[model samples]
Target: NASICTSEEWQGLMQFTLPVRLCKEIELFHFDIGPFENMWPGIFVYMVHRSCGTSCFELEKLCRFIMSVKKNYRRVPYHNWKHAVTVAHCMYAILQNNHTLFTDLERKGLLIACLCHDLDHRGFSNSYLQKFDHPLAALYSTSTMEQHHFSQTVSILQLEGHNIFSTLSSSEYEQVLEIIRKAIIATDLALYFGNRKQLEEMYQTGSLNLNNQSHRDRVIGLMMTACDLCSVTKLWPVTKLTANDIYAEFWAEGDEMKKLGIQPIPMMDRDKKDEVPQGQLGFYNAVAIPCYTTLTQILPPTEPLLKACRDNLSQWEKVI
Candidate 1:
């Protein structure tokens, strides 16, 4: 089990060791609680342990990996452990709702990819990194952060004693990693435009068959995007809090951009903070509404996302 493979420098005590305790309070898939980063790993372990059937040692290693991943995230306003766990939690809810539609490998991939998709995010977008020759931007020509997150997922899995897939066959391990890569990269909103059109066409043509592997992969990708931005489909109070955190992160990036002599975009600028809800209106019209509309067409159980998003849109309209 590679028990002796870890180096002394790599080994450390877990800072967030409350997973066993905090995971019990998890009930609903959305808005059951606020953005409590502490509950993430516990809930993760609770769900995955029931579904994946890992040994106690494997579970311990997984928790250590989760804690380390949490530690690695920057103390940013958003895109931290809280964001990762929230994304994963949403994926868990979707899987639970439609467990019959996904294979065991696909379910595992979706959950793990959601957890690791934004690992070590620096509170900025790829567009913010474009003007500079950062290593991450250079390493990935497209979907820079997504690629980096997938790479980090692989690295963490390779860590000593962290091979949670030890129960899977060799081919299954390879397939799961491949799925994780695709799902994580699909979280990029830029990819959402192309995927949305393709999925929309498939839905309109009545060709979205769960039996078709290619179509299924595409569906998983769309789900990744849906859950990544699931806050828009949450209750108004929950959505409002998450929106503030997201913009705080955006403005932090903008603040840094100005210090570097780059003019921040309107969406990123704190000076335009008063117009945030108005900008969100455009986002809903352009992205959120259409995205959820298509997803609910395929996964009818996800219709609540469409309804709540529309409700939030109206809230935005009133504020704007």
Candidate 2:
């Protein structure tokens, strides 16, 4: 996504951010280093689209849509394609392990939304959408930030900016789109109270016996909140790549806000010199870890994965 691609600005981050460095090291170790990405540019997008039976070459259009919006990053630290890829991979891992909890259609939908949730994303938080009452809100009428993000993402897969689903059979695409809608809206922390309840209950019980799994007819409402926050436990390379994405996205957006004389979003402000990763570690320790730990317990195999996450916390110990 060269929209955020500024070689001069990021000359130093290749050395500073572990994930970006790791993406580089792995790309070099596995593929043809810098000449191209580890895989084709939109392989992730294609996988997302094709999984839904989204029957057209138009899915390739996502590359254009995301790249177009990235040129105006205001959220800076982790609001880029790398972050999207990282999250997609995380949810992908979750589904792979817990396939029993999702239908093929539902799984495909979540994956597609993950890739597109931040398309045309301003890097600024929901406050941006809520404040000006962006055009996207008028269109969707609710959970506007996420709806816009998802719809806009799907839109770019066409000349008219709305063809990603055109390839799907009518009813099937609607089903898939429904799944995407649930996932995109979940991004809003405001609507996450129910998510909090499930995890909090699990923290005490140490199990994932969720019922009413709505993603399917058999049962519904899996432990989705956990999936959203569970990436902390990914392999160190994946973990750090995600972390680096966070920094790059933040710095990029923060810088843009200053240039435009706009009030930056929380934690996205470039001038927040004191809010380093160290201070943020407390939030991770207090909230993120406790929540994810209970989730890994409920989900099993993620236990070792989370150990790696704990290891990362220690690595950050010496950072600040």
Candidate 3:
């Protein structure tokens, strides 16, 4: 679907305020706003204003930038605009209770990074791109898609009338961009895995000091991963639908790998569909649970996420 909106539409979008009910539901992590896709840009606008305030951003430019970001997302089954919106919403929810954890500029940067992290995703994993010798593979040897996503975020910002951060001073602009880059790249699970042990040690040792820039950076990365994988933290019904969409995208990649005479991994292999629940169990146990658990340890306000993830883990365990 074409994502471009007219000037009147942008003006109308700017008028949207988050309903009180939706605001509460969002904070509870129980809302599924994906079905109302048309409201996403407005919700995004609302979050930006709520997170960063209205004084620094031009309403029209922000709307145009958001619309362009939406337009750039391909119609992938999982990593689409809906997913990005949901991730941003998760960040917004986290910020709701823990606003003082980050600076105002950090809040703005993280929200924008979450919104743009999966731009133009093609329903393929980094391995798939490398295996196929896709140009994006050659473009960055590590965190290929994430790097590309950050680059796309920059490109969109550079476009005419789309620089939402234009009001920032040179140093502030550079700092925000750096925040955006690290936050966007942190969505790559590989990086999360790499950082998890250190994070865990820091948590266990009670050495995580938000006062330290490095510690804050690590926590910010953890926040990004928490938001990105928050589907499991949602209610079971919503999480189930998201899991199906994820596997649909995964299996599509598997089908392509098969046609290319390459064997797909079990999670991606359509023939192994019966093992979905088991695979999900392993994922939650090994990845999602620990990620959320450590996050809650660092920021106790996120206990809801850890609790929901444990609940979902039990649900999958039952299915198996």
On lDDT, the leading prediction is 3
lDDT of predicted model 2: 0.54
CA RMSD, predictions in order: 3.9, 8.3, 1.9
- The lDDT of each candidate is 0.80, 0.54, 0.88
For candidate 3, the per-residue lDDT at 264 reads 90
* Top TM-score model: 3
Per-residue alpha-carbon lDDT of candidate 2 for residues 133-204, written as tens digits (9 for 90 to 100): 666656766666677676665444443442545656889888877777677777765665566566556546
Better of 1 and 3 by lDDT: 3
**Candidate 3 TM-score over all chains jointly:** 0.96
Candidate 2 segments whose C-alpha is farther than 4 A from its true place: 1-77, 128-142, 157-171, 202-211, 214-231, 234-266, 269-271
Question: Each candidate's TM vs. the true structure?
Answer: 0.89, 0.64, 0.96
Question: 1 or 2: which has the higher lDDT?
Answer: 1
Ranking by TM-score: 3, 1, 2
Window of ten residues with lowest summed lDDT in model 3: 1-10
If both were scored by lDDT, which would come out higher, candidate 2 or candidate 3? 3
Q: Which 10 successive residues of model 2 have the least lDDT summed?
A: 26-35
